[PDB]
Homo-oligomer: 30 residues x 3
């Protein structure tokens, strides 16, 4: 259970880093 | 405690997809 | 361990809410 949850958390941290970058790009352009 | 963490991770992941789509929709309007 | 996972989930929840705010704002500016 623990290793699967951690791999999911890592996946979340990645998706959120990338979303933050997209948003920061949008904020510059909008 | 453990159950609840796995459920929050599940609802987080089932939210990053909506946010991803919302951001992709915004990328087209700027 | 569960402690670290809870700490990361609280960080991910905060970033989620912040990105949701960022997206609401961007929607008003396009
Ligand atoms: Na991305
Ligand atoms: Na859910
Ligand atoms: Na995008
Ligand atoms: Na802002």
């Amino acid at each position: 259970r623990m290793k699967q949850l951690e791999d999911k958390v890592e996946e979340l941290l990645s998706k959120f880093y990338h979303l933050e970058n997209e948003v920061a790009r949008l904020k510059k352009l909008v």
